[PDB]
Design a binder for this molecule. Sequence first.
Ligand SMILES: O=C(N[C@H](CO)[C@H](O)c1ccc([N+](=O)[O-])cc1)C(Cl)Cl
Lengths: 117, 201, 48, 27, 103
Amino acid sequence: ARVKRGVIARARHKKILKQAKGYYGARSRVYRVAFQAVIKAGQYAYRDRRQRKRQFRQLWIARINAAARQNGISYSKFINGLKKASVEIDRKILADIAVFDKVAFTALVEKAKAALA
Amino acid sequence: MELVLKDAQSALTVSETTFGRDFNEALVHQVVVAYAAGARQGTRAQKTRAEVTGSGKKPWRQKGTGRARSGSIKSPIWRSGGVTFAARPQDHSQKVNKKMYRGALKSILSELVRQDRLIVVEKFSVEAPKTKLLAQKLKDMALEDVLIITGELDENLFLAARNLHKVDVRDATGIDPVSLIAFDKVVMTADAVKQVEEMLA
Amino acid sequence: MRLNTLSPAEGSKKAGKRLGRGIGSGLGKTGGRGHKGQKSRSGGGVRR
Amino acid sequence: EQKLISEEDLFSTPVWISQAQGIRAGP
Amino acid sequence: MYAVFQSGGKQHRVSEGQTVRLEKLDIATGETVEFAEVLMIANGEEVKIGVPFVDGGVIKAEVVAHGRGEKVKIVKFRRRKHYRKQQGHRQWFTDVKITGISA
RNA sequence: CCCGGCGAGGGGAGUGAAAAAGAACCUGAAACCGUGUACGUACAAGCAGUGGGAGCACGCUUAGGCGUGUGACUGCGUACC
Ligand SMILES: O=C(N[C@H](CO)[C@H](O)c1ccc([N+](=O)[O-])cc1)C(Cl)Cl
């Protein structure tokens, strides 16, 4: 009962070289190199799902700050103003409003200015 | 506990412990596995590193050459002369308890009754040893894939059945567990019942 | 009951071990022997 | 008529004797 | 005119006719949902929240599809320590079309 | 029948179901070596990936800012055993 490997082993390798498309040099050609490349791709992929959520918030905060200071208040006071005014609009939405409706954003600065005084 | 005869209309009284008892799936399965294991020609072999034809000299000087160290051109890592754990002829047959065998025959036979795959008749024989003659009879009874168990090893019946693949003939003494399963219908003579009954009891 | 509708009893046929066949099996590398020393060796061990 | 060549590329040349041979160390 | 509302424990800024992808809702794909907790409504003029949520403010919407998104692969991997796994995930979602912003 | 050293090797015709079945002949994978288009690249410094993420080009997105490729800038990031 001799079992030959030919068909199954090729299929397993071809799956990996397919995951390695676009990579430079041996990493897309040579299984031994590709297999290490594809795993580390996975390790970074896992990681950057968590990192992505850090990067975007830093962006939103930075944009609100710019627009807040444009209406004559700092980010840190503005958010505190909104909290004591019991406004709950989050920073993804606020950074969006900061760009596309500067007039609504100004109205949120007053709302937050009133409460803060 | 009565099995109705096909045509004579003369019911036959049998032991409910033999023909009327519950199907033991786990038991039957064990006895069918051992029969099939009992059928193998355990005939094979390969060569160990001791048995491959070739020489005992180390290829290398142990040290100094850049190669991997070697001891034997018959090492199982080497092309030719491999086979780390080579096969021998071996006996695959298994034990079955007398009682687990009989108990198993009884369970399957009792199911045959329940599934209406068992056919009881007064007599079952043929005239001249012509397979064609048997073939005619079998169509008439609406049977095709069938095991025949007769009272005595009837020869005409035996000869006529040899070329019919879907038909097998057997005397009561020579029955076995897998044949009673492997056919769509099973035919037993009245005499065949009495012999099977005594045997299992 | 046909030859292709028979099974063993549940819990009748435990599968048993096959060492050194990948990380997933749990027994890849070493094979349950630990690392080095007399017990890890082929034919290795002390008498009764 | 281009039959394969003898080649005579059997390569039992491996492996020739191998001294350092060499630096003296280190005592 | 847009409005802001909660749903899949996250917020969305949306206008009428827009399709927006939410966390899974227990609603059949032809029924209408109402979101009655709305953080802002803005048109020519703009009513914002004081107490959280707009007083008279309701958003009505139609559930258009349930489905599953692109597969993502999780890999965990401890080098030299004879450990890894790999593992799959597809996340549920409901898509809704905004049909009404009620101020 | 041609090119061609009365060569090799090719191209036609013809055989042949099929010649990309033609004696270096069943099928006919990859490392490796090529030709052809798409995009990228000569002020720009490092496990070559991933998270962002401009173009430009395709399949019209087959009226719906949709799929494939390519991907400038940019945040993280020292292979495996
Ligand atoms: O092989 C030698 N040198 C090795 C190099 O691997 C080592 O660096 C070394 C150097 C100096 C020495 N000494 O001065 O006695 C001994 C060893 C001999 Cl000189 Cl000992």
